[PDB]
Design a protein around this ligand. Sequence first.
Ligand SMILES: [As]
Ligand SMILES: [As]
Ligand SMILES: [As]
Ligand SMILES: [As]
Lengths: 104, 104
Amino acid sequence: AKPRNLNVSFQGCGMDSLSVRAMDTDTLTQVKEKILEAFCKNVPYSQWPRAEDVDLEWFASSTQSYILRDLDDTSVVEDGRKKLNTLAHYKIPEGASLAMSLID
Amino acid sequence: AKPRNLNVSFQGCGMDSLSVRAMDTDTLTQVKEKILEAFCKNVPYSQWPRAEDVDLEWFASSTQSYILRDLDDTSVVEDGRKKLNTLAHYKIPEGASLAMSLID
Ligand SMILES: [As]
Ligand SMILES: [As]
Ligand SMILES: [As]
Ligand SMILES: [As]
């Protein structure tokens, strides 16, 4: 378990990508929080998108992208409860290209 | 009364400025709506900032900027009611540089 430096683009407008450091053990909500803190640092917090307002997609291949969520159908189920997905759960590599998107 | 092409920056992230056409007779809410439509075209409408979430500032001089609102203390008062400020009310020139900002 180590830190991961992610190259995140925020899709929808022509912003530059940002390098964001997250932890393998961060839940993907926490990963989103860190990304939003990085992108929205110069804006009042009352106006930031929330974790629930955005998807985070990992471009694993040219043809395969995986939407990274806390809970989904790849989540470990333990003693009758789902466990939260972490960055390490999806085996996200160092320098991975991620895209963040506002959703309906 | 004519159209005005405004050079609008959206401050807070490193987006390029956009040229936005507004009418002299547009209320500043309508001007904001047109600007948000231009900047947020590729994002779901449920996630756009609203007119009330942003200020629009006109850099009239190097040292003077005026926040452009529908109603303020420069508004014409007629028969006991304030009249909505328009783009023409502030005498905004063609090719004017404006900045839009998210507010608390
Ligand atoms: As955006
Ligand atoms: As932001
Ligand atoms: As912004
Ligand atoms: As937008």
